[PDB]
Every structure is written in structure tokens, then in C-alpha cells.
Amino acid sequence: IDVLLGADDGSLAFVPSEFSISPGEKIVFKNNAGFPHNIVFDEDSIPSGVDASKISMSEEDLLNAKGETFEVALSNKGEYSFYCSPHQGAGMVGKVTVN
């Protein structure tokens, strides 16, 4: 599934921001508008026993050019909360369900 970082009107959002995938399906996050951006999974808001370090950017890492991507595949089922670190407060948050 492709997820834009930043809406085409420059809104600070994931598009889409809530979605479901099957296990081992790839998510391609692509720098769209309003970057730099990143993708960080909430360690306290993913399935038990998942290593967030395996599926996220560092807080300190950025995608700073149009079209840079980060890709990830999730396998454990459950809900995963993620955010953009610099824009979390702006509401640039999402949630994926692996079902």
C-alpha cells in the first residue's frame, strides 16, 4: 500500500492515515508535501513483543526530499500506532491494523 507523507494541498497528514493490511504486505511511505517527515511507531502502541526499532525510523532521522520513501512490512497481527516526530503535535498520526 502507498501512503503519502503530506497531502497534495500541503496538509500535514498521512494519506491514508487509517488502513488495514495483510501480514507481510509492504507499506511504502513516500515524501509528498510539507517535508521533512519521518515515520515512528509508538513502542507502547504496537502488538506485544514487536521490536519498534525493526519497523521505524529513528526520531532523529528525516526524509527531506520530495519522493524519498521508507518501506516496511509488518507480520504480527494487531493495531499499530505511528506518527511523524516533528509534526506529531500538528496531528500527523496514523494507525494500521494487520488482520
- In the annotated binding site, the residues are 37, 84, 87, 92
Residues in 19-78 that interact with Cu ion by CB under 5 A: 37
Residue number with CB closer to Cu ion (69 or 75): 69
Left if phi > 0, otherwise alpha if psi is -120 to 50, otherwise beta: which for 67? Answer: left
Q: Which of 74, 92, 96, 98 binds Cu ion (CB under 5 A)?
A: 92
Is residue 87 part of the contact set for Cu ion (CB under 5 A)? yes
Q: Which are the contacts of 73, defined by CB distance < 8 A and separation ≥ 6? A: 24, 25, 26, 27
What is the distance between the alpha carbons of residues 55 and 53, in angstroms, rounded to a whole number?
6
Segment lying near Cu ion (by CB under 5 A), choices 45-53, 56-64, 65-73, 90-98: 90-98
